[PDB]
Amino acid sequence: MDARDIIKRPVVTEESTSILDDKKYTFEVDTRATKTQVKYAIEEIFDVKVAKVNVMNYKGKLKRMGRYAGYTNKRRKAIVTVTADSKEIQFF
Amino acid sequence: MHVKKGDKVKVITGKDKGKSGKVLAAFPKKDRVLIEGINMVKKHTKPSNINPQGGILNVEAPIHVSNVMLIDPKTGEPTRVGYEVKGDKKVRVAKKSGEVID
Amino acid sequence: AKECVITGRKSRSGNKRSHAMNSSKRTWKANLQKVRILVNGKPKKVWVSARALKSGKVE
Amino acid sequence: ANDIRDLSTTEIQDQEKALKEELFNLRFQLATGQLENTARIREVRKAIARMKTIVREREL
RNA sequence: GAGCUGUACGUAAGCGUUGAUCCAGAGAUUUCCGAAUGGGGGAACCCACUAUCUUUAGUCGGAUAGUAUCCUUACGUGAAUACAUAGCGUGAGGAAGGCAGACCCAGGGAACUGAAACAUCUAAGUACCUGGAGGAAGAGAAAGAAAAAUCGAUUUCCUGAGUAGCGGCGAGCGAAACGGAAAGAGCCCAAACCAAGAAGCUUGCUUCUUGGGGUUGUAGGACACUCUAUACGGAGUUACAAAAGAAAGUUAUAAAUGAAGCGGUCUGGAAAGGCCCGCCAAAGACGGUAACAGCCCGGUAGUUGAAAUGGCUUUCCCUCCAGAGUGGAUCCUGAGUACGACGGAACACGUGAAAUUCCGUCGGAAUCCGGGAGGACCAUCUCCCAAGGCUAAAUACUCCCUAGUGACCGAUAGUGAACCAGUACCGUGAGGGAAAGGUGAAAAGCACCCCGGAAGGGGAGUGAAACAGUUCCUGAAACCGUGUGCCUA
RNA sequence: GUAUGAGUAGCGAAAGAAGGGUGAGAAUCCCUUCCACCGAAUAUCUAAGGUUUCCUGAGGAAGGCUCGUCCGCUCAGGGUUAGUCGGGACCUAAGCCGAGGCCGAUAGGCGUAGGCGAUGGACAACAGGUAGAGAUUCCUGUACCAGUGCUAAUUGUUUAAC
RNA sequence: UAGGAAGAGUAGUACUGCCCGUACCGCAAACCGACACAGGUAGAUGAGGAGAGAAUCCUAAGGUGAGCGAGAGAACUCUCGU
Ligand SMILES: [Mg+2]
């Protein structure tokens, strides 16, 4: 699968935007994506030099609208830090 | 449906019988037609983003298509409608006026 | 398995009556013997009934 | 559909990649909160599907 | 042919007479688990190998294909052991699993109950488990039925008939043929015999392959001769051998056209209703529309319509084909089977005088002057040739699709389920399993003022109705309250 | 569906008191002081189990055996970072599956090679920081284990270093 | 050792290292008991005075005041003291 199907969308929250000046970017990746495929996906798209990647898996919450209950989409989140001598992603 | 957007209409039945108007919208999913000046209502709308002041509004309400029959644009009376293929196209022909409505 | 290779002989069921005809249940087997015969030109040890073997088969 | 059947099967790949990139930016822009034309995503995504169908049937 | 982005209100952003949304036919894509089949596994997860390509300075990473087991068949390699087999590998074909809780064929096979107890018997070859299919299955072309004469493959229906029979002769079980109908269709091998080939050496012989012949009963065939036909004619993929193709018509899957009252008037919130006048009808079926409509709308009778796919019929094409007679030297006509003893089973028939068919074990024929049956058996007579195979229709059922019907139900009824139902809930698990329909014609779903934090109210307004205000048509009884006429320490 | 028993039994071991604050509303919510309780536990970690109950901002209909401005309750947003920790890509016990195979009316049973299976064996990381929620995981400092490329010189060649 | 072999080590630099779990409760109001239930739930650490001791009484670090109250001080019932 291509580099733009490994990565889906950015994550903009209070915690995610807190580490922008620390050169740590948070992304939504595919569930089957590994820690290595993400490293090469970013290098191809944004043309930077990835130094370290961390990932974690989130279970689906149990929402309830009316009398119908279901599970929110299961997610996989990755945090990618770029080396010092690499250009910064806009992400704004 | 025998009536589309833009036709001129003479109503048949209802509390508002005998008046004429022009159609403003059509709802084939429920067989109802909106005609200006016909079947007005009063909406008690709370002040909101749209029309900030709010109040009593005088807008129209849809009516069933069955209570509507098309009038001949030229001669000017209501009449039933018929379809006659001509010029590689289908047009509406009045059963009374004997002319193409469109 | 437990069936004559040549014929179709194998186990079959039935009743075991007695005096006063108290019907029980039982079974009938066949004289299946383990012998070596020729099936495709290759000797093999298979079941052959004694009635079938009594004429026309070479061991 | 037929507007692109005249292409030479090699610039279609350039159209596959160009439209795939534009789709990514739209998802990136929507997530941040900068996209005001949210309808564009669908036409871009259909056009990606349209081009792949023609290539598939060209080689049967 | 003018609106559309589902249920689903609504916001944002858009698309459509360059013809969108929509309907029907044909294609394309089709993650993971699941017979799951590269290995593993606690369902949707983990871990690989062999090739080709791709990326990096290289490790790392990515893309495509193949890699399960068994059966059949060819090739190659190859042990004790010399040849060879067993084994090993490759190549090509087939299978696995599911269900429609229905129908039917086979293997295995109860008990409760009845007999007013109970064991023979009945319940019953029923319930259930297992295997095999098919749109149907099974049966099927007489070793038949029957008797003063004959019929002529099988299956199903009416009668025969609760008859003849079986039965601790108890409870009970219970036929068949003739007769009347639906449908009707007949064929292919084995064996002698001829020809070719091969192996053994059965040593010029017999035992195997193929082709040609040939299949029946007052016997037929091989064998001898006469006659004719080598496509003149005949048949066909539903048996009789099998594989395809073209054209025409017809049907199913979208659709089109389609007559006649805006008639006057009364009540009403609204006319389809009452009164008085007209029209169409191959159309007075059904539904909707502010109340009961043939003439307001979708339609109905009638008449048209198909680019594409599938079915059905016909024709063409294609393919394949020897059948009549007279002599009867000799030869052939399904062997460990037909029957018999022993022990069981099915036949309406429970060992009984027990004919008929089948199973397990022993014994064990004749073969055309021959053999079987006609309810033990012998003789005469009559009918028929078993121990190989195939075969459409009349018959049984409905998970489904289309068009309809009911002196069937109408929310405690009808499916468990008219409603996000095998759901919520219960149980470790198999499993058990609910309750819950209605505002109004149209949201016109109460702007605004007052009390209150809010809920909730009193006015105002919409509405025919608000005493229809989001469990909202109608609103009984139990039960809970307020006021009063008569009585009561 | 609704009564009688009836405003009755009960309100599930335990020491609270006062002063400020918020609020429409305070014995029950926040803060302060005094007092009392456990202290081989009523303390600190960590398996099984549960699966969002964890944090922040709003709410008081229902749940809380009273009250509520509060909550493990309602609504909306967030939160789990590993070469070194535990388990896989390592190993096997009990046990389970099982190509061929043996047995058996059908279904299937037993079992070899082989493979799964921790409660056991082997295996490289420590100290500090972090006022909303993660820490041997993120950050600072200092290491270790396996592997690769690039330089540096050294060394060896088919009685064949390694 | 059988075998495989033209490449090998050492030093110095830079670079690479996958999947699953990680919140929270965890002698409890979040697990098993229909309950915010006087019951049950493996393992590690588990201080001081007196003491042989993880007994016993009072305390340290740490955690709590128990999800109905106030006011009278009758019979009777229960748990205690003479
Ligand atoms: Mg992780």
Ligand SMILES: [Mg+2]
């Ligand atoms: Mg099958």
Ligand SMILES: [Mg+2]
């Ligand atoms: Mg079956």
Ligand SMILES: [Mg+2]
């Ligand atoms: Mg048949």
Ligand SMILES: [Mg+2]
């Ligand atoms: Mg009409």
Ligand SMILES: [Mg+2]
């Ligand atoms: Mg009228």
Ligand SMILES: [Mg+2]
């Ligand atoms: Mg009415």
Ligand SMILES: [Mg+2]
């Ligand atoms: Mg007998």
Ligand SMILES: [Mg+2]
């Ligand atoms: Mg007879």
Ligand SMILES: [Mg+2]
């Ligand atoms: Mg048959």
Ligand SMILES: [Mg+2]
């Ligand atoms: Mg009712």
Ligand SMILES: [Mg+2]
């Ligand atoms: Mg019901």
Ligand SMILES: [Mg+2]
């Ligand atoms: Mg459960």
Ligand SMILES: [Mg+2]
């Ligand atoms: Mg109010």
Ligand SMILES: [Mg+2]
């Ligand atoms: Mg009323």
Ligand SMILES: [Mg+2]
């Ligand atoms: Mg009504």
Ligand SMILES: [Mg+2]
């Ligand atoms: Mg009392």
